[PDB]
Structure formats: C-alpha cells, structure tokens
Amino acid sequence: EELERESEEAERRLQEARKRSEEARERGDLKELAEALIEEARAVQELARVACERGNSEEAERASEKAQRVLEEARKVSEEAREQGDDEVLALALIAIALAVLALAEVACCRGNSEEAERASEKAQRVLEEARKVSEEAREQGDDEVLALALIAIALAVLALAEVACCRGNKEEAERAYEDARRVEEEARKVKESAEEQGDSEVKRLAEEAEQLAREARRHVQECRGGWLEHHH
Numbered sequence: 001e002e003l004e005r006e007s008e009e010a011e012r013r014l015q016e017a018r019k020r021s022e023e024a025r026e027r028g029d030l031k032e033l034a035e036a037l038i039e040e041a042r043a044v045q046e047l048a049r050v051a052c053e054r055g056n057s058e059e060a061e062r063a064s065e066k067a068q069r070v071l072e073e074a075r076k077v078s079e080e081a082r083e084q085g086d087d088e089v090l091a092l093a094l095i096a097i098a099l100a101v102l103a104l105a106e107v108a109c110c111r112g113n114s115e116e117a118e119r120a121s122e123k124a125q126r127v128l129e130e131a132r133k134v135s136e137e138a139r140e141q142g143d144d145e146v147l148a149l150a151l152i153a154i155a156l157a158v159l160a161l162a163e164v165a166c167c168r169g170n171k172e173e174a175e176r177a178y179e180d181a182r183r184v185e186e187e188a189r190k191v192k193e194s195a196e197e198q199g200d201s202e203v204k205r206l207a208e209e210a211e212q213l214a215r216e217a218r219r220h221v222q223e224c225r226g227g228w229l230e231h232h233h
Contacts, residue, residue: 003050003053003054006046006050007046007047007050009046010043010044010046010047010050011043011047013039013042013043013046014040014043014044014047014066016039017036017037017039017040017043018036018040020032020036020039021033021036021037021040021073024036030077030080030081030084030086030089031086031088031089031092033077034074034077034081034089034092034093034096035092037070037073037074037077037093037096038092038095038096038099040070040096041067041070041074041095041096041099041100041103042099044063044066044067044070044100044103045067045099045102045103045106047059047062047063047066047103048060048063048064048067048103048106048107048110049106051063051107051110052106052107052110055110057111060107060110060111061107061111063103063107064103064104064107064108064116067100067101067103067104067107068100068104070096070100071096071097071100071101071104071123074093074094074096074097074100075093075097077089077093077096078090078093078094078097078130081093087134087137087138087141087143087146088143088145088146088149090134091131091134091138091146091149091150091153092149094127094130094131094134094149094150094153095149095152095153095156097127097153098124098127098128098131098152098153098154098156098157098160099156101120101123101124101127101156101157101160102124102156102157102159102160102163104116104119104120104123104160105117105120105121105124105160105163105164106163108120108164108167109163109164109166109167109168112167114168117164117167117168118164118168120160120163120164121160121161121164121165121168121173123160124157124158124160124161124164125157125161127153127157128154128157128158128161128180130153131150131151131153131154131157132150132154134146134150134153135147135150135151135154135187138150144191144194144195144200144203145202145203145206147191148188148191148195148203148206148207148209148210149206151184151187151188151191151206151207151210152206152209152210152213154180154184154210155181155184155185155188155209155210155211155213155214155217156213158177158180158181158184158213158214158217159213159216159217159220161173161176161177161180161217162174162177162178162181162217162218162220162221162224163220165177165221165224165229166220166221166224166225166229169225169228169229170229171229174221174224174229174231175229175231177217177221178217178218178221178222178231179231180217181214181215181217181218181221182214182218184210184214185211185214185215185218187210188207188208188210188211188214189207189211191203191207191210192204192207192208192211195207
C-alpha cells in the first residue's frame with residue numbers, strides 16, 4: 001500500500017513530465033525538453049524499483065518499455081543539441097539517457113534476464129564514452145557547468161555498469177566499474193572544490209551529485225553479493 005502511493009505518484013510525475021516535454025518540444029525549447037526528459041527518467045527509475053520490490057515482471061517490463069522510450073527521445077534531443085552546438089543541452093540529454101539506461105539495468109537484473117542486462121551494459125558503455133567526450137570538451141573550454149553535468153551522466157553510466165556487473169556476477173565488468181567510479185569520483189570532488197573556491201554554488205551542487213553517484217557505484221561493486229566481486233587492495 002506504501003508502494004501504491006509511490007507507484008501512482010511516479011506515474012503522475014511521468015505524465016506531468018511528458019506534458020512538459022510536449023510543451024517545450026512545440027516551442028523548440030530543447031533545454032526545457034531535456035530537463036523534462038530527465039524528470040521522466042527519474043519517474044521511470046522509481047517505477048522500476050517499485051517493480052523490483054513487488055517482484056512483478058509485468059510492471060518491470062512496462063518500466064523498461066517506458067525507459068526505452070525516454071532513451072530514444074533523449075537520443076533525438078542529443079542529436080539536435082549537437083546540430084546546434086549546444087553543449088549544455090547535450091549534457092542534459094546524456095543525463096536523461098544515462099538514467100534511462102540505469103532503469104533498464106535495474107529491470108534486467110530484477111527480471112533475471114542476463115541478455116537484457118548485457119544490452120543495458122552496452123548502452124551504459126556507449127553513453128559513458130559520449131559523456132567522457134563532453135567532459136573533456138567542457139574542461140578544455142572552461143565550461144564548469146557543462147563539465148559537472150557531463151560528470152553526472154558519467155557517474156550514472158558507471159552506476160549502470162556496476163548494476164549489471166553485480167547481478168551478472170561478472171568480475172571483469174565489476175573491476176572496470178570500480179575503477180571508473182574512483183576516477184569520476186575524484187574528478188567530481190575537484191570540480192566541487194574549485195566551485196566552492198569561486199563561490200559557484202550551482203556547479204558545486206552538480207559536482208556533488210556526480211561525486212555521490214560515483215561513491216554509490218563503488219560501494220555497490222565492493223559490497224555486491226557479500227563482497228564477492230570486491231576489489232582487493
């Protein structure tokens with residue numbers, strides 16, 4: 001009954017985000033569209049986690065279908081963002097993509113479909129590489145906000161990799177995720193400290209998202225299955 005409240009609220013959030021997405025889409029406002037797709041992805045992640053807790057494969061597959069939809073829409077926005085040379089919107093789109101992939105990973109693991117989980121890992125690897133390029137470009141251009149956004153997309157992607165690596169029991173993937181998470185964590189922390197130094201509170205907040213997402217990814221790998229896939233120092 002508690003999950004019903006969360007499930008219905010999640011669907012409500014998704015529908016409102018879909019309407020906001022359509023409003024921005026008609027106005028050609030890609031930034032608002034991208035932000036709305038992030039909200040959709042958040043809602044879809046919530047639906048997936050509710051499905052996981054209920055053990056309902058039907059609700060889980062529904063969540064995956066919805067995640068795939070957000071993914072494809074965010075892919076289009078990223079394409080349009082690159083055509084306009086709009087790195088900020090691109091980074092936001094990649095966050096939506098990465099969060100959707102994480103949702104796909106969660107469903108794959110909960111449903112126990114290893115093939116479906118590997119596809120999610122491939123998508124996570126893809127968006128990771130794309131987000132890495134954006135972070136490099138932003139860092140060279142001195143765009144601290146875009147950099148921080150790209151790092152969030154990266155951390156979400158590494159979270160997705162950690163997710164699959166754990167439920168598939170693949171130690172090679174787990175090691176890669178672990179090392180990825182440490183790197184992005186350190187990058188995010190430095191961006192956070194530089195922002196604090198300049199009084200750039202917005203960048204600080206964004207860098208903190210990436211940092212804590214990265215920390216969760218590391219914890220997930222290290223603690224997965226009683227520490228079976230843990231990186232030994």
